[PDB]
Amino acid sequence: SEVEYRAEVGQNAYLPCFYTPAAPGNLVPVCWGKGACPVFECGNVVLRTDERDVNYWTSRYWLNGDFRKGDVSLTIENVTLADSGIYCCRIQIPGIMNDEKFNLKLVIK
Ligand SMILES: Cc1nc2c3cc(-c4ccc(NS(=O)(=O)c5ncc[nH]5)cc4C)c(Cl)cc3[nH]c(=O)n2n1
Ligand SMILES: [Ca+2]
Numbered sequence: 304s305e306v307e308y309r310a311e312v313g314q315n316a317y318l319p320c321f322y323t324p325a326a327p328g329n330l331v332p333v334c335w336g337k338g339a340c341p342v343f344e345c346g347n348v349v350l351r352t353d354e355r356d357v358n359y360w361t362s363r364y365w366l367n368g369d370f371r372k373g374d375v376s377l378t379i380e381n382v383t384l385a386d387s388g389i390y391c392c393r394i395q396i397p398g399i400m401n402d403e404k405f406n407l408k409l410v411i412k
Contacts, residue, residue: 307408310386316379318407320392323373330354332395333375335364340391340404350377379409387411 310316324330332353338346350366351359352375357366363381368374375394379386387409394403
C-alpha cells in the first residue's frame with residue numbers, strides 16, 4: 304500500500320497540493336504536469352501559475368481552490384483510464400534550487 308488518489312472513469316479526480324505564501328498576496332509560480340517531478344520541470348505540463356495568475360492550462364485541468372492562499376490542488380474533470388499515473392506539482396520557490404516537489408499517484412478504474 305502507498306498514498307494514492309482514486310477515481311472511477313467519468314468522475315473528477317482531486318490531487319492535493321499546497322504551499323504557504325511568504326506574505327499575503329505573495330504568490331510563487333506553480334507547475335503541474337503528468338509524470339514524476341524528476342522529468343523536465345514538472346513532467347508533461349498541464350497547468351501553470353505565476354506570481355499573478357494562472358498563465359497556462361489544458362482542457363479538463365483546473366485549480367478550483369483558493370490558489371491565492373496557496374491551495375494549488377488540481378481537479379481533472381471527466382477522467383479516463385489514460386489519466387492514471389504519477390503527477391508532479393512543483394512549487395517554484397525563487398531564490399535557490401529549493402523547489403518543493405510533490406508526486407501524486409492517481410489510480411483510475
Ligand atoms: C474554457 C476553459 N477555462 C478553463 C480554465 C480556466 C482556469 C483559470 C484561469 C485563471 C484563474 N484566475 S482568477 O483569479 O480566478 C481570474 N479571473 C479573471 C482573471 N483571472 C482561475 C481559473 C480557474 C483554470 Cl485554472 C483552468 C481551466 N481549465 C479549463 O479546461 N478551462 N476551460
Ligand atoms: Ca528554486
